[PDB]
């Protein structure tokens with residue numbers, strides 16, 4: 131099935147998912163000099179105080195921390211968004227090496243990893259109806275660089291050895307995603323897509339300018355996970371990032387002067 135290898139990676143996905151070559155695919159390179167400040171952007175609001183995490187899952191292409199989204203609890207609003215978007219899961223993409231791993235790039239610079247906090251537009255009732263809409267989803271993307279440890283990531287790192295292989299899950303209650311944010315909420319935003327199959331064009335992307343720092347040791351624990359299931363040949367879960375796609379007829383907007 132699809133993956134990140136030579137034989138089933140990003141350059142192959144268009145054969146099962148023709149929208150891979152569509153008009154608003156993600157990720158993209160963010161050219162910081164051509165992005166334009168947009169005074170029409172409203173203040174961004176990340177409201178994660180009542181977030182209810184449930185579980186952490188290795189799905190064979192990343193690990194997802196999943197949330198109870200059956201009520202307004204952890205939401206994103208403001209900035210480019212109309213209405214309220216509810217947090218359902220987050221996950222990361224990372225490299226085999228510190229020099230690559232992110233999906234978005236900034237003036238062609240690749241970060242060591244990228245966090246995606248996925249939210250759906252509550253006008254559409256649930257996530258599955260939201261992914262049928264061009265404004266169904268909003269993803270907060272956050273770059274990771276290797277330097278000082280991020281304390282609010284350590285509870286994630288310490289449970290990874292319990293979900294080493296595809297299809298494994300563990301309880302992951304009482305996790306506070308506010309510990310994964312940087313200080314500043316300055317961001318770039320543009321319309322795009324899922325970066326994994328089915329690559330649907332539903333997404334308002336909001337990519338924070340300030341990266342978080344994680345330690346070498348934290349990111350090395352991500353690279354011990356496996357793409358395969360238990361009892362199949364071991365393939366390390368590394369380089370699970372899609373490269374930058376053509377910008378096409380889009381402009382990237384900046385929240386900051």
Ligand SMILES: Oc1cccc(O)c1
Pocket residue numbers: 161163164
């Ligand atoms: O916006 C630009 C224009 C020319 C070279 C480049 O790296 C970026």
Ligand SMILES: Oc1cccc(O)c1
Pocket residue numbers: 187194196218219257
């Ligand atoms: O693990 C999950 C839970 C919810 C939505 C999704 O895309 C993945």
Ligand SMILES: Oc1cccc(O)c1
Pocket residue numbers: 184196197198199200218219
């Ligand atoms: O965390 C989740 C995962 C799947 C569906 C859902 O509504 C929430």
Ligand SMILES: Oc1cccc(O)c1
Pocket residue numbers: 246248267269323324325326333
């Ligand atoms: O599950 C998702 C949802 C939206 C964008 C993305 O890259 C992944």
Ligand SMILES: [Zn+2]
Pocket residue numbers: 221222223246325
């Ligand atoms: Zn992602």
